[PDB]
Write a protein that binds this DNA or RNA. Structure first.
Ligand SMILES: [Mg+2]
Lengths: 206, 72, 188, 50, 218, 208
RNA sequence: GCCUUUUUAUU
């Protein structure tokens, strides 16, 4: 959370739709990062309870992560205007765009000729500023899904499975043309990481 | 090297210095031409300028070295 | 000794690739280039060294020559391939012989913010300082006087200096911080 | 009001406090202004802008 | 020219500890106090998580059914977990936590050499009774800090091999003993608890003295 | 794995003079090149033994503002050059020194007497019945706290360290520590860092 | 394998 902020900081999170805002207040029964249920009180109900599916690690428009973490514990009662799960870059209803670091306004042996920042290794150690960028690699198959080229990241279907630690410069989704030459796509160098989920829609991965 | 102010005082014009250093670099790349300077681990860019630092390579005396290679 | 297996050696990133790389970039000129060049000094050559981090370390002395602070500006970089173009970068486009601006007689290499601030804190006069009114053998002894911590950086003392044009010596009023500068300046 | 808030903590009323250097180990003659200023990482990252 | 001795070690807790370095000469308390402060933060033997292998979930971002805290913040609590090994640099630790209740560090089953000095460290929270978690905590012993970039289900995390967190030294006045230019140096170390604070100064002085042997060679 | 560290090769050991020298230790660990240079810097300036003059006794001169007759020298210059005297003694700590000059002529360190184990290695610099006391001291003392000259006890005059990047073909951003130094010539500059090595090693034998 | 508009953003 911002150590120095404004009273408006509590209002941006409760007005944004990417942060989970409870429609009906009450105590909670099962708090998970995937979904949170809230037992609706006798006055808030009209019955049943409501559910809130939290979008965990989905792709945004700028190839950036969006994840909704919960902020309440088990058995915690909330009202209608309260927040049950903070969104991305949010904690407990306060918008946390960054992290409060121990900033010393002084030059140190260079590195501050202009307004650039000299950062600690502690910031690199405790993951105080490391973010997640979820990029999209779409595959237009006009073109079979089989990866018969003239590897270990595939489940014998031409499609990479969930959780493979790919590296820039390997095959990701096999796409051969009916002729057999390989004209598929690959991962560019510098974005090596794990896959969140491979959405196949319109054959074993589908 | 670091600066080129010692090589430019032997030739004068700066654009004549690039012409004599490029022709010296072509001889050191294809046709042998081991330099008179002490050879170090630096590339042929500095060797083309270290020869003009003391004045053993000039634009007038490089043309008579090309004709000496043509007579042999 | 081929072009196919040499691509496999680069993409594997083993230990022998970096030792080959530092021999190529030991004295190779590399053109640093801002994307807006509304001035002559927007393209300057450099002799880079291999570092970690995917950002270029543009020199602070030529930062005022680029007229571009370190505000997160993303800008280009270029290299000359052939040897007749590499000598154009060392004799004309290098940052060493780009001291004076083409516009005026004042040099374009001007200390803007921080190095001038470190020079200004040294060249100062203070009363009731640590080590006020003591003799010093030379300008190099002021580095011994300050790093040990018994005397302040600004104290009215008398240091011995050797000025050139041939060497003259006089005992004038010079603080501790200005005596650090005499080992930095040249002889003349 | 901030100097009054500095009187509550163990740190003194002055906004700048004296401290030692990392690679040197000497106390500064001029105290610098340390503090928990809110900083944020932008979207322009060097993994994408290279 | 006086050899400092660790004559007193005062520990207010297992996290924060304070040692004494006496006797040191004047001008050397800021010298030896800064030199021991830098090397303690540079490279010291610390034990942290390197690879996590969880059954079910494959990568480090997918949330698991039955937990409350997110799985990427579980690895942050594993980075704050302070463990100590004695004879083996590679160890395998498991959770096997079932039922209701928050996952604590004391629930982690440890061997005879593995000892967790912070039992109150909370890893995550379990809100489902029938759902359970089980991971393979792999802890390596090293120095410095390594990134996560430098086994599909075995998700890679970054390992922080820093057993200390902050080092506090200051020069104070010592006793006379009929000698001038004599000062007292104490060193306050807020550690994770893996290394002994008497052994923290001792091991940092061994690798300091080993680096000074090349200065004898010149 | 955790006890093994990078040791420097000690290749670039050059000397531009007998007093000034520039050494280069490469490679070193990241974060080690600053602390190995800074700790040995303060040892050579504050924590090392040396030999220098302590008190000046000139006939007819009791104050710092005076004028000598018969010689082409002033009072403010005669105690400044004597502070940077390359004086060394090894047998005893406290030793006296006398100076006798007659007529009009320049005074240097060549025509002076040794009076035992006192050695003078720089007789070229310019410095009457002047008696001075040379005793052993540590580091550097000022003339303001003595309340009658400041003693340049340490033989080195200036030491600065610079750290650049080093490459070991398996790690990156390692420290490459260079050390420029200049002394009075009483000890060798290669021996000056070696003397500071044994001073720091004698402080760590109780820990190790 | 691209190209051109539009929007966002940077100097
Ligand atoms: Mg800018």
């Amino acid at each position: 959370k911002p150590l120095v902020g404004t009273g408006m900081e509590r209002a941006v999170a409760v007005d944004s739709g990417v942060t989970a805002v409870a429609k009906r207040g009450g105590v909670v029964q099962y708090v998970d990062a995937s979904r949170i249920v809230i037992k609706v009180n006798e006055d808030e109900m009209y019955a049943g309870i409501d559910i809130y599916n939290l979008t965990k690690y989905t792709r945004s428009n700028q190839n950036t992560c969006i994840n909704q973490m919960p902020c309440v514990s088990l058995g915690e009662p909330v009202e209608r205007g309260d927040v049950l799960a903070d969104g991305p870059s949010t904690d407990l209803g306060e918008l946390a765009l960054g992290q409060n670091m121990r900033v010393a306004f002084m030059p140190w042996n260079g590195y501050n000729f202009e307004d650039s920042i000299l950062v600690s290794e502690r910031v690199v150690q405790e993951d105080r500023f490391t973010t997640i960028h979820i990029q999209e690699l779409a595959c237009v198959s006009r073109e079979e899904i089989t990866a018969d080229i003239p590897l270990s990241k595939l489940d014998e279907s031409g499609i990479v499975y969930i959780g493979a630690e790919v590296t820039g410069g390997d095959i990701l989704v096999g796409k051969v043309t009916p002729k057999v030459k390989d004209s598929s796509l690959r991962v560019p160098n510098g974005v090596s990481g794990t896959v969140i989920d491979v959405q196949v829609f319109t054959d074993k991965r589908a | 090297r670091v600066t080129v102010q010692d090589a430019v005082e032997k030739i004068g014009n700066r654009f004549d210095l690039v012409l004599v250093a490029a022709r010296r670099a072509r001889q050191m790349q294809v046709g042998g031409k081991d330099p008179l300077v002490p050879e170090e681990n630096d590339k042929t860019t500095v060797i083309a300028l270290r020869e003009i630092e003391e004045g053993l390579i000039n634009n007038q005396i490089l043309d008579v070295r090309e004709r000496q290679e043509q007579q042999e | 000794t081929t072009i196919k297996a040499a691509k496999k050696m680069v993409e594997r990133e083993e230990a022998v690739v970096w030792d080959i790389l530092d021999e190529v970039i030991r004295e190779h000129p590399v053109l640093l280039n801002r994307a807006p060049t509304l001035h002559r000094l927007g393209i300057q050559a450099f002799e880079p060294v291999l570092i970690e981090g995917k950002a270029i370390q543009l020199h602070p002395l030529v930062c005022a020559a680029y007229n571009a602070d370190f505000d997160g500006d993303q800008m280009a970089v270029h290299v000359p391939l052939t040897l007749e173009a590499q000598l154009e970068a060392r004799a004309l486009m290098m940052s060493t012989n780009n001291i004076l601006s083409p516009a005026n007689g004042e040099p374009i290499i001007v200390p803007s913010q921080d190095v001038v601030l470190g020079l200004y804190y040294m060249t100062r006069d203070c009363v009731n300082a640590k080590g006020e009114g003591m003799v010093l053998t030379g300008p190099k002894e002021a580095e011994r006087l300050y790093r040990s911590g018994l005397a302040s950086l600004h104290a009215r003392v008398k240091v011995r200096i050797t000025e050139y044009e041939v060497a003259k010596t006089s005992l004038k009023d010079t603080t501790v911080g200005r005596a650090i500068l005499w080992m930095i300046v040249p002889k003349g | 009001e901030i100097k009054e808030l500095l009187k509550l903590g163990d740190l003194p009323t002055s906004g700048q406090i004296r401290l030692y250097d990392g690679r040197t180990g000497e106390q500064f003659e001029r105290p610098v202004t340390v503090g928990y200023m809110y900083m944020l990482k932008l979207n322009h990252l060097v993994d994408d802008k290279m | 020219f006086l050899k400092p001795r660790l004559v007193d070690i005062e520990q207010v807790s297992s996290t924060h500890a304070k040692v004494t370095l006496e006797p040191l000469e004047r001008g050397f308390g800021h010298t030896l106090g800064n030199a021991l402060r830098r090397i303690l933060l540079s490279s010291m033997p610390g034990c942290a998580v390197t690879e996590v292998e969880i059954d079910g979930v494959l990568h480090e971002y997918s949330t698991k059914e039955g937990v409350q805290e997110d799985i990427l913040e579980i690895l942050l609590n594993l980075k704050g977990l302070a463990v100590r090994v004695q004879g083996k640099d590679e160890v395998i630790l498991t959770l096997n936590k079932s039922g209701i209740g928050p996952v604590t560090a004391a629930d982690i089953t440890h061997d005879g050499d593995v000892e967790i000095v912070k039992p109150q460290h909370v890893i995550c929270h379990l809100t489902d009774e029938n759902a359970s978690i089980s991971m393979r905590i792999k802890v390596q012993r090293g120095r410095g800090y390594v990134p996560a970039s430098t086994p599909i289900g075995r998700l890679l995390v970054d390992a922080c091999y820093s057993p200390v967190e902050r080092i506090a030294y200051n020069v104070e006045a010592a006793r006379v003993e009929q000698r001038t230019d004599l000062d007292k140096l104490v060193i306050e170390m807020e550690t994770n608890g893996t290394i002994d604070p008497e052994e923290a100064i001792r091991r940092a002085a061994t690798i300091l003295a080993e680096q000074l042997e090349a200065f004898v060679d010149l």
